């Protein structure tokens, strides 16, 4: 029991944890709630801003469970990283439980790309 408790203590990371959902809505996709999620190949400017967003590590044998491996299935999934904290961007438009994967991230950055696109009531992501 004590040995199991010591192990569970090892299972928890020493640095801080953060995961953030990044979404790209379109122009008419405002209040779509599917074309939002089902979107792909966002605007050029949105993709640019996205490139310079820290560093990423491909999910495969190369990357160990050391960093957050949530959803080993499929890609770039950029992940900010330093020693005190560590922030992974668990889902983007590039990612496609998955619906729950991005409906559970407590905070989301969203690329407007529209005209008065969004009000919080739009998103069905409870968390």
């Amino acid at each position: 029991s004590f040995e199991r408790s010591v192990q569970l203590l090892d299972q928890i990371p020493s640095y801080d944890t953060h995961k953030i959902a990044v979404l790209y809505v379109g122009e008419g996709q405002s209040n779509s709630e599917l074309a939002i999620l089902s979107n792909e190949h966002g605007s050029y400017r949105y993709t640019e801003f996205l490139t310079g967003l820290g560093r990423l590590i491909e999910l495969k044998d190369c990357q160990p469970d050391k960093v957050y491996l949530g959803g080993l299935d499929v890609q770039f999934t950029y992940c900010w990283h330093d020693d005190i904290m560590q922030a992974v961007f668990h889902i983007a438009t590039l990612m496609p439980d998955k619906k729950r994967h991005l409906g559970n991230d407590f905070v989301s950055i969203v690329y407007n790309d529209s005209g008065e696109d969004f009000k919080l009531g739009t998103i069905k992501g409870q968390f």
Partner: protein, 49 residues
């Protein structure tokens, strides 16, 4: 692989949006100009009357 050439695919997507959007706008712009020209005649007739 630079995120699978993400900033190379959007470029292509932006070009595709500009092509079709430009064509459709020109197709409409002509119709509106032809309509305005048509209005510029019926109105003159009415003024004469």
């Amino acid at each position: 692989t630079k995120e699978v050439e993400m900033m190379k695919a959007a470029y292509r997507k932006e070009l595709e949006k500009n092509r079709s959007h430009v064509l459709q706008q020109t197709q409409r712009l002509d119709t509106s100009q032809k309509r305005i020209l048509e209005l510029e005649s019926h109105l003159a007739k009415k003024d004469h009357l």
